[PDB]
Amino acid sequence: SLLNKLIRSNLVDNTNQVEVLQRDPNSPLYSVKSFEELRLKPQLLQGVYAMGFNRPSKIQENALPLMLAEPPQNLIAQSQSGTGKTAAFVLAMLSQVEPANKYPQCLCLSPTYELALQTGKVIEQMGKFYPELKLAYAVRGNKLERGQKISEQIVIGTPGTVLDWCSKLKFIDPKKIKVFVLDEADVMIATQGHQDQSIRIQRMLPRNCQMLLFSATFEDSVWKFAQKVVPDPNVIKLKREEETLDTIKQYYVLCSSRDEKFQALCNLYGAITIAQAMIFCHTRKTASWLAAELSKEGHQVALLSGEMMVEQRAAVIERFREGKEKVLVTTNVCARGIDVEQVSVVINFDLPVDKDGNPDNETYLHRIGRTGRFGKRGLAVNMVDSKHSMNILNRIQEHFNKKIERLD
Template identity: 70%
Template sequence: MGFNRPSKIQETALPMMLADPPQNLIAQSQSGTGKTAAFALAMLSRVNPAERFPQCLCLSPTFELAVQIGQVVEKMGKFCVNIGVMYAVRGNRLPRGTVIEQQIVIGTPGTLLDWCFKLKLLDVKKITVFVLDEADVMINKQNFLDQSVRIHRVLSPNCQMLLFSATFEDPVLLFAQRIVPDPNIIKLRREELTLDNIRQYYFVCENKEDKYRALCNIYGSITVGQAIIFCQTRKNAKWLALQLSDDGHQVSLLSGELTVELRAEVIQRFREGKHKVLITTNVCARGIDVTQVTIVVNFSLPMDFEDFADFDTYLHRIGRAGRFGKKGLAFNMVEKQNLPLIFAIEEHFKTSIKYLDPEDMEMLEKIED
């Protein structure tokens, strides 16, 4: 799979996850450092292939992420005899009474909840490993939290619990420690959260038309491998996709309102490089791993419900570029009144986000050097 040596998180976490007797773990690590491969290995190593029922459960917040994790597990597990993966995601409907023989089940909370309690397709008491990926959002969002906790409550006391994310705010970490017995904790200090391999810039724009012109100037000046453009609303994402398509660019649009089949198709086309640009909302801010992505554009800065800068989402978004320590570029389009958000992000991550004039083509061309 191209791993020559373990990344820092793999080196630290794997001995804990594979120890006997099993140990619980709450782990934080930068985007793109191989967390999925680490817990995929842990699940594969705990499975007893002779027993044909679900033994490992992995929960993730989105359909795309669940499928991506499953693909990593399948790729790593292809040399393990008789180990199978089942996807508990919207669109994969199993009739009541179905016997699931696959030992690893990966899914989203709502569907998995139905499978466990309504349809009784799996016996949660027999689960030996429970993984919560993007654990901070699974704990921080009320509906996800209720669903995750419901599943967690019926697990056997001997079940190994593994919680992973790139970001853990203190209240979330405290809650995680309450639900995970005697956990090992791998936590990054705030100063370790800066993404040094990603150069960050901002443009000051009046409106969305202004932002669009700046985007076209980036296109004209920089060799775009593949890019992800984040919008705060579905409406803006649609508008932008239409503008770029009308200007002859090959773009994909991904938002939560698409069917799961369409979402899977869009991600696959982008992975295969058939489309160079993916326009999306926060549905893709976490975990989506496409190695060729070199540029992330925040068409709108991520904000929370009180219109403050959403630091975690910013970190996850720009972490889509610069996977595994590669170089990446992040461009932020900012209205004048939102400039304090940029300064807040700089202060929070102790990083530098440099101002660029979108009309200064010469300066834009120098960025690649």
């Protein structure tokens, strides 16, 4: 019985909430034209409606004409958290595949295991009205009898495994790729992200390959780099005022230590478990420590980090997906792209700093973006442990120019 128990206020939100948003010009879900006015193929329109999609979001309306335009043109595009970019590029991929040809024509790169899995599902479900459309997972969990070529028309994978499939394993002839999609593009091409493997895969593609880059964020230099690595691109860039959702409200709690952050969250756990929530940490060790501390305080809790094996990672993410786990202590491995409808609270138990210790503005926006997705109303609570930490948050605040409330 407290203010943050007003998660329950969002537990059962309004009758035509999303529809009203898709009629507001100031909404990034805004729709001035129907799906049939985008002139998608019939099987791809059936796939769309089959998912319960009613109206295209801003990014979908604007990107698909640019991506389906003939002859093909590359695209570097930005749209906010939970605005439907996956459906945007999946429709792009499916729209250029010729199912008769039993080899990889369309390749998609995600930064992490779980995002590949998640996106793979959307691809299968979106193209389901092509009986012969098949999807191959170039992900860590997977191993095929060596010496073969995969006969699936669409590959989704993570940078390393795809690189091996396209090189020493010879599973995919990369020269036959028509559409190349980099999801969460900005981290896929940034030096501290997957630049090396990403570019080394790109180099293996044919000259006539359409290239599509999507993300909610494009750091200043990354935007300039993407322009030089992607030939002749159409560009969708946001103004920075547009980058934060009105639908995700941002808080912070002031503390003096890690023990004090543990106690706060302890007191708030009853509220967090009403629906579902995510807690981010700066490192794997703190993730694991937090998990053991919550668990020893008697709270059921889920852990997910990169040191876990894929079997365990796949296990947890599915359990969380089904609401069998209600809280997931995690690292930046889940900062991006993950889409779980019920996650109504995101907690930065550690504030997102970069390698050097600088405020990670991009990661912050992706992290808080795991709540309040496609029109749902969400909540992001920041745990501040020091004065230095308070500064990090204040610099983020005026990066985005979006003030963050204090919580008692």
